[PDB]
Amino acid sequence: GNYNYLYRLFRKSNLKPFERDISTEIYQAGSTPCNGVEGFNCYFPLQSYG
Amino acid sequence: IRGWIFGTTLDSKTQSLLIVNNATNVVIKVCEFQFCNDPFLGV
Numbered sequence: 537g538n539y540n541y542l543y544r545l546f547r548k549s550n551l552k553p554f555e556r557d558i559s560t561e562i563y564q565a566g567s568t569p570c571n572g573v574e575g576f577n578c579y580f581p582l583q584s585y586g
Numbered sequence: 587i588r589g590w591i592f593g594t595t596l597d598s599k600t601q602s603l604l605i606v607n608n609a610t611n612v613v614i615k616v617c618e619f620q621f622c623n624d625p626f627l628g629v
């Protein structure tokens with residue numbers, strides 16, 4: 537299984553044309569602030585292709 | 587005046603544009619810069 541290729545799975549808004557976003561900030565999917573700490577409702581925005 | 591810096595957070599975890607005129611050539615980069623509180627040059 538090759539996991540070197542990634543794709544962003546969450547983002548607060550859609551990308552504008554030809555916009556590139558490489559930030560790895562933890563996406564807060566809930567009402568609880570993550571403060572850079574992963575956990576419940578606090579996900580890494582990138583995910584590997586299988 | 588020598589340059590401009592553009593971005594959203596103007597710090598790391600994201601990219602930010604930097605344009606700087608040295609003395610004979612303008613350098614433009616988009617690295618994930620960690621800018622200082624009061625950035626400036628040391629001429």
Ligand SMILES: *[C@@H]1O[C@H](CO)[C@@H](O)[C@H](O)[C@H]1NC(C)=O
Pocket residue numbers: 548549550551552594
């Ligand atoms: C650009 O960054 C700002 C920073 O808060 C954000 O509000 C805005 O949604 C971002 N632009 C896009 C297209 O997501």
